[PDB]
């Protein structure tokens, strides 16, 4: 093979020897707005976002029933 379609990764042992391996974050945060929430400390949510979040304080048993 040429090498264009090679495997796009490096084995964990070689990464560990390079000092490159990271283990963490089974989850992720796609948007920077969502990433920097815990660092902003003053507007974790915009005002519009806050009023939109206020609509889901409880689950909707009416919608569940319907």
């Amino acid at each position: 093979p040429s090498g264009a379609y090679r495997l796009p990764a490096v084995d964990y042992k070689r990464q560990l020897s390079r000092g490159t391996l990271v283990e963490g974050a089974d989850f992720y945060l796609p948007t920077a707005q969502e990433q920097q929430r815990l660092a902003r400390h003053f507007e974790p949510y915009s005002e519009q976002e806050q009023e939109e979040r206020r609509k889901f304080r409880f689950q909707s048993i009416s919608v569940y029933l319907a």
Binding site: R53, R54, F56, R57, F58, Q59
Partner: protein, 31 residues
């Protein structure tokens, strides 16, 4: 002036909402 209106208890003591549970995530189920 004296009080004469019949004051109900719902104007004073509000009951908590417990029929449908809380969403601490504040996000819908499909989301």
């Amino acid at each position: 002036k004296t009080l004469e209106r019949n004051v109900p208890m719902k104007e004073i003591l509000q009951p908590l909402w417990v029929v449908e549970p809380p969403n601490f995530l504040r996000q819908p189920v499909w989301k």
